[PDB]
């Protein structure tokens, strides 16, 4: 069976319970903590590219308020459609299989000023998203996979104090 697991999940969830925050700027700053995932079930054999896109959370922004976060308004109008390519792509199942896969390089901007950046929503939550497209495919067969414990809202600065220390805390 084709199983793609989240690397490092005890980390995020030490994020997720406080509320993960991902800086976004007008020229794309990497994540903290990085995507990573092992793969196992592909066929070691075919070619693969990985793909990372950010779904949007819930119909509403999110606030910051007396410790919390609350809703804290309609959204704004959904981001482009931004999808990141893995650079390691395309490549053998075998390669995606023997080592971790990590999207240490993608950058989350809140400003279109190229570079392959993630445009997203400054007070709005995303939840990270991978996909696997096989290569040369008629069928053009691509897998999904949503990974609810690396959720974030957008910031243009950190909200959370605890997420600030966390952040330098791990990193
Ligand atoms: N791509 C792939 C390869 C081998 C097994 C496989 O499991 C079948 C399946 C799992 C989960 C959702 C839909 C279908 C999927």
Not at 37 to 64: C, E, I, Q, T
Not at 78 to 88: E, G, K, M, R
Not at 117 to 133: A, C, D, F, G
Not at 154 to 171: D, G, M, P, R
Request: net charge positive; charged share 20%; hydrophobic share 35%.
């Amino acid at each position: 069976e084709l199983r793609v697991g989240l690397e490092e999940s005890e980390l995020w969830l030490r994020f997720k319970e406080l509320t993960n925050e991902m800086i976004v700027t007008k020229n794309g700053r990497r994540m903290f903590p990085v995507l990573k995932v092992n793969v196992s079930g592909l066929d070691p054999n075919a070619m693969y590219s990985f793909l990372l896109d950010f779904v949007a959370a819930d119909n509403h922004r999110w606030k910051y308020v007396n410790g919390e976060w609350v809703p804290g308004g309609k959204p704004e109008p959904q981001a482009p459609s931004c999808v990141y390519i893995h650079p390691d792509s395309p490549n053998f199942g075998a390669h995606w299989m023997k080592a971790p896969v990590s999207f240490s390089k993608v950058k989350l901007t809140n400003k279109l000023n190229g570079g392959g950046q993630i445009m997203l929503n400054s007070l709005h939550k995303y939840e990270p998203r991978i996909h696997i497209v096989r290569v040369g495919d008629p069928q053009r067969m691509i897998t999904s996979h949503c990974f609810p414990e690396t959720q974030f809202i957008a910031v243009t600065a950190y909200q959370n104090e605890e997420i600030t220390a966390l952040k330098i805390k791990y990193n």
